[PDB]
């Protein structure tokens, strides 16, 4: 691994950093709320006569299973533009609540039901918010929304004072003041009737062919989930690194009971950096701390590959009563796990050291591990030994109030010193 890291076939004496280790989770637990009954979306979808734009209906659905691949049979269409969610993934997500609605318009403005779309057909009739997330469906409804004599049940508004607020419906019918003449009379010049009606005939082609629009609009919030799909619940495990799913909140780690005084309305726990800390069980009323699985870094202390072939491993910043567990049956993030707990395991403030024997001795530091611990390759035939660094040779000076020491001979010596002065010039 070190040879791969350095992109070379030869390495020199020193300590190198290679990669990280992480105890992968063993099993998974999935807990959902206990949803009862099925809400039929088919009868919700269709109406005997689709309401006009100036007065559109809406239904709010909750407390039922969320199956969404069944609607392909109860409504003909061509697009199924589910922008927010992948259609096949709806069987698992848990939602707060959902809205369903439908209304009939002309085909010239099918793309006008979208965030940021302006114009009289959307500004004064129906405009989406800029952060819409749903499954808009548009169908060319000529077989069921037209008559040879001209179907006249369809209505919209064209004149009004100012733009309407998002998802607001106005059903009043009052003569708009579109001139200097005071519009108090029933009708006349400069007094226009706000409600213009469509005229639909089979002679009309595309564009003017009437269309029907069906909208399912989700809304997601960190609130008690009431809608979720058909997924089976599972049981609970504790104190072991596992995958967990809670109400649609995927995660991985260890779960342990904690003395968190959550108030009844408070549900989640959070801390700095938007990291989830505690979760509330969808079935029982219990609060538990969540802690990420143990991880760390691995370093390789080796002498020169010229000299020998043995190495020693150092796991940084982990108590190595859990490293043998980290050496599991094809579970540890590093592929190699041969070392495991093959004796000569030493504990150090920096981390845990495998492959070297502690010696009650003191030399000069050669390969520095840290916290005053340094290793070397030597005999005791040849092995790796780790020891506490030695500052130097202890000395005692016979200080006294009437003593002096004077030299009687000298020595000339010559030393060397090297200093860089410049670097290679370049141009790009």
């Amino acid at each position: 691994e070190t040879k791969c890291t350095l992109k070379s076939f030869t390495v020199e004496k020193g300590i190198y950093q290679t990669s990280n280790f992480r105890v992968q989770p063993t099993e998974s637990i999935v807990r959902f709320p206990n949803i009862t009954n099925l809400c039929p979306f088919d009868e919700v979808f269709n109406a005997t006569r689709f309401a006009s734009v100036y007065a559109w209906n809406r239904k709010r659905i909750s407390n039922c299973v969320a199956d969404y691949s069944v609607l392909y049979n109860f409504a003909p269409f061509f697009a199924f533009k589910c922008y927010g969610v992948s259609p096949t993934k709806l069987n698992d997500l848990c939602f707060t609540n959902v809205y369903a609605d439908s209304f009939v318009i002309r085909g010239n403005e099918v793309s006008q039901i979208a965030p940021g779309q302006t114009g009289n057909i959307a500004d004064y009739n129906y405009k989406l918010p800029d952060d819409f997330t749903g499954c808009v469906i548009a169908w060319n409804s000529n077989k069921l929304d037209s008559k040879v004599g001209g179907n006249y049940n369809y209505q919209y508004r064209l004149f009004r004072k100012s733009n309407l607020k998002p998802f607001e419906r106005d059903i009043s019918t009052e003569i708009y003041q579109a001139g200097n003449k005071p519009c108090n009379g029933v009708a006349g010049f400069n007094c226009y009737f706000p409600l213009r009606s469509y005229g639909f005939r089979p002679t009309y082609g595309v564009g003017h062919q009437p269309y029907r629009v069906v909208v399912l609009s989700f809304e997601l919030l960190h609130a008690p989930a009431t809608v979720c799909g058909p997924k089976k619940s599972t049981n609970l495990v504790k104190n072991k690194c596992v995958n967990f799913n809670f109400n649609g909140l995927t995660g991985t780690g260890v779960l342990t009971e904690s003395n968190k005084k959550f108030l009844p309305f408070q549900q989640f726990g959070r801390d700095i950096a938007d990291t989830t800390d505690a979760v509330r069980d969808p079935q029982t009323l219990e609060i538990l701390d969540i802690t990420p699985c143990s991880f760390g870094g691995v370093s390789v202390i080796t002498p020169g590959t010229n000299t020998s072939n043995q190495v020693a491993v150092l796991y940084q910043g982990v108590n190595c009563t859990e490293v043998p567990v980290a050496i599991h049956a094809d579970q540890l993030t590093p592929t190699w796990r041969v070392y495991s707990t093959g004796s000569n395991v030493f504990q150090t403030r920096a981390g845990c050291l495998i492959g070297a024997e502690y010696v009650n001795n003191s030399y000069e530091c050669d390969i520095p591990i840290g916290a005053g611990i340094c290793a070397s390759y030597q005999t005791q035939s040849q092995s790796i030994i780790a020891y506490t660094m030695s500052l130097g040779a202890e000395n005692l000076v016979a200080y006294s109030n009437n003593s002096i020491a004077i030299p009687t001979n000298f020595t000339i010596s010559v030393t060397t010193e090297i200093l860089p002065v410049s670097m290679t010039k370049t141009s790009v």
Binding site: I272, G297, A350, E394, V397, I404, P407
Partner: protein, 322 residues
């Protein structure tokens, strides 16, 4: 760490990051270089003595009082009262948030291994003078060393021998006052606190910046991956990858500049320790204010403290000259 920070242990995120190339290898190399440099910095300031010297059991220095600075064996750690005050004055949930890859490695030279160096330097500089800077240490009585030090600044040596008691009293009183001077004001140890605050604040702002959106759907990898299909999920997470890479690059650049700043102060401290401590300095206003006499080193969290002993004239009388 490269991956564990940018990618929340995902699988497709790692493969998408491999496309960008070897950006994070330079980040992993620069931090290692900085760590090696900061381990080497403390090896020059302190490790300048050949051997660990020791003081004699009987402590009497011409009437001078060094009890405030010499190590006291009563404490578990051989640290002088001044060092004990300095350690308490500097103040070293926040660490639990560093589960995203951030780590702090321990220094190579532990604290008592530094206290032993400081004690050795004090013993050498109060027993043998400056002779142990160049060759083997040679014993010499302390008042004679003081006579040499006065002779070094143009004052004849009879001045000391006729005024031993007064100088001893002044030295003792000065040390006594300087012991309280640090504790009186709280802003004496400001640079060291600035160092620790800058490091902590940089780490905190990195961790907080981790949770931004950078114009994406959401700030959590798991939600976006389980929320959309891959062909749009990758488009959504590309912006997150770019933002986090930019944040890491900014962090490492700032750390490089700060390390370059610190190295100059380390070199200056090494020069002062070589010149002021192991000898007498003729440079003006270098080793304290006034004519320089002696110096004493002490250790503090991530730093060194010098006590400069200097000589200053006083009462003046004016005469006629030719």
């Amino acid at each position: 760490d490269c991956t564990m920070y940018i990618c929340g242990d995902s699988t497709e995120c790692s493969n998408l990051l491999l496309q960008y190339g070897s950006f994070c290898t330079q980040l992993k190399r620069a931090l290692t270089g900085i760590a090696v440099e900061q381990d080497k910095n403390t090896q020059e300031v302190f490790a300048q003595v050949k051997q660990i010297y020791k003081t004699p059991p009987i402590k009497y220095f011409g009437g001078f009082n060094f009890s405030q600075i010499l190590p006291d064996p009563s404490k578990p750690s051989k640290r002088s009262p001044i060092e004990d005050l300095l350690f308490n004055k500097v103040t070293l949930l926040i660490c639990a948030q560093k589960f995203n890859g951030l780590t702090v490695l321990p220094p190579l030279l532990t604290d008592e291994m530094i206290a032993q160096y400081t004690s050795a330097l004090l013993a050498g500089t109060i027993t043998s003078g400056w002779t142990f800077g160049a060759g083997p240490a040679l014993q010499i009585p302390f008042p004679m060393q003081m006579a040499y030090r006065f002779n070094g600044i143009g004052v004849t040596q009879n001045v000391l021998y006729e005024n031993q008691k007064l100088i001893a009293n002044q030295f003792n009183s000065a040390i006594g006052k300087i012991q309280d001077s640090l504790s009186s004001t709280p802003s004496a140890l400001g640079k060291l606190q600035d160092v620790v605050n800058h490091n902590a604040q940089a780490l905190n702002t990195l961790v907080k910046q981790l949770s931004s959106k950078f114009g994406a759907i959401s700030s959590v990898l798991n939600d976006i991956l389980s929320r959309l299909d891959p062909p749009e999920a990758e488009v959504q997470i590309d912006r997150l990858i770019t933002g986090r890479l930019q944040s890491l690059q900014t962090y490492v650049t700032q750390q490089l500049i700060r390390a370059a700043e610190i190295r100059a102060s380390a070199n200056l401290a090494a020069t002062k320790m070589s010149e002021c401590v192991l000898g007498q300095s003729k440079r003006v206003d270098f080793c304290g204010k006034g004519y320089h006499l002696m110096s004493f080193p002490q250790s503090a969290p991530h730093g060194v403290v010098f006590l400069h002993v200097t000589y200053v004239p006083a009462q003046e009388k004016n005469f006629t000259t030719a």
